[PDB]
Amino acid sequence: YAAGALSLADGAALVTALGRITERVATGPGASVWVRATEDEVRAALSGSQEQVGAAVAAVDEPGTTVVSGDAGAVARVAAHWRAHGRATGAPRPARLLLSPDDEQAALAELRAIVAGLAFREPEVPLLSTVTGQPVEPAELRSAEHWLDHLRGPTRFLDGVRRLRTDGVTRLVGLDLSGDLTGPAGRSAAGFGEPGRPLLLA
């Protein structure tokens, strides 16, 4: 909506569908944790043991932290493994992703039944997505597979913030009503590009 790509009517509509799908995920049987280990440390452990399959990296917010989510047993054992080894983790919290392909076939239908009802238009300024880590194409925006990916794939915030600073952004404003989003933006931005370049976070 801030990119001029939806009307207020379209924006109001879509948030209600993503809202209902989110209740199903949050009430589901799974869990999540934060871990003070990076994607190259965690992806190796998550791939390199059949005994814990049923988990994934849910978010990549800043260089020092990853969030793991899936089956509550798989989440608990992967959390404990790093606490025993040499890193901090949080206490358990609700899941953040779909937990069966049974969820996907319903959520796809519900989104396709609503996303065709959104009167989209080409954005006035570049719109970046945490599914893609790249500027959204107008053909991606119109497709419900792009919108359901928020419940399927990793939230690639870090790589998005990197592309803001390759592409010349200097000052970076945070609508921090929940999740403190400008903090992880500063912690992902101040370790990249040319030395001494300005960076204002407000």
């Binding site: 800043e62 020092g64 912690r187 101040a190 001494g196 300005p198 204002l200």
Partner: protein, 50 residues
Amino acid sequence: VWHALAEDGRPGAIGGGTGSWLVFSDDPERAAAWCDELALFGVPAVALAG
């Protein structure tokens, strides 16, 4: 004369993880704290002590 950097005193950005930062301190806890702080930003660091 010590003059305030009141004009333009905003830290800017560290130039990427192209090489490590060594930290040496009289206090091993301070060396660890600064190496842990740098790690959150993806700037790789190593702690040393006498």
